[PDB]
Design a protein around this ligand. Structure first.
Ligand SMILES: O=C(N[C@@H]1[C@@H](OP(=O)(O)O)[C@H](OP(=O)(O)O)[C@H](OP(=O)(O)O)[C@H](OP(=O)(O)O)[C@H]1OP(=O)(O)O)C(F)(F)P(=O)(O)O
Length: 135
């Protein structure tokens, strides 16, 4: 996959907060490839000329094996340490697929979390991802 960058050299990413329902009480996290006992928000790099909302949906299909109704842009989040900029969308999950690309290819796991518990497991390694939930 070709990595893309903003004019200031930050890597362009898109991600979804993948909720079980329109009540947005439970969210899907996925395991880190580099560190499988860590949870992250599914998302990843935008391809050349790829709209952020398209990249967001593609990446959560690839990583989390879900599909659903794309909701609002929550915001654009910089990670100054890692020099990336992430567009973060709400996705209401309508389809949970059992044998998805990163499960098959790299053994990636997924799990539902209550919002408060998602914030807790992201805080240590992924504080910017915890902040996606601050509304
Ligand atoms: O390696 C790092 N983060 C990498 C992602 O790993 P995690 O964010 O899951 O820890 C990795 O995601 P996976 O391949 O593990 O799913 C992918 O992030 P992305 O593909 O979601 O963007 C990759 O980016 P690439 O190297 O561009 O693939 C990221 O590295 P940085 O983009 O340098 O943070 C890190 F920042 F150095 P760490 O301190 O988290 O180890």
């Amino acid at each position: 996959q070709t990595r893309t960058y903003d004019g200031d050299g930050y890597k362009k990413r898109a991600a979804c907060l993948c909720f079980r329902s329109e009540s947005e009480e439970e969210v899907l996290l996925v395991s880190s490839s580099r560190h499988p006992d860590r949870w992250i928000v599914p998302g990843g790099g935008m391809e050349p000329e790829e709209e952020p909302s398209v990249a967001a949906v593609r990446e959560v299909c690839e990583e989390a094996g879900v599909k659903g109704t794309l909701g609002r842009l929550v915001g654009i989040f910089e990670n100054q340490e890692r020099k990336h900029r992430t567009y973060v969308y709400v996705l209401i999950v309508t389809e949970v697929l059992e044998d998805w690309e990163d499960s098959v290819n790299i053994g990636r796991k997924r799990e539902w979390f209550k919002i408060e518990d998602a914030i807790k497991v992201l805080q240590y390694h992924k504080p910017v991802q915890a902040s996606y939930f601050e509304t």
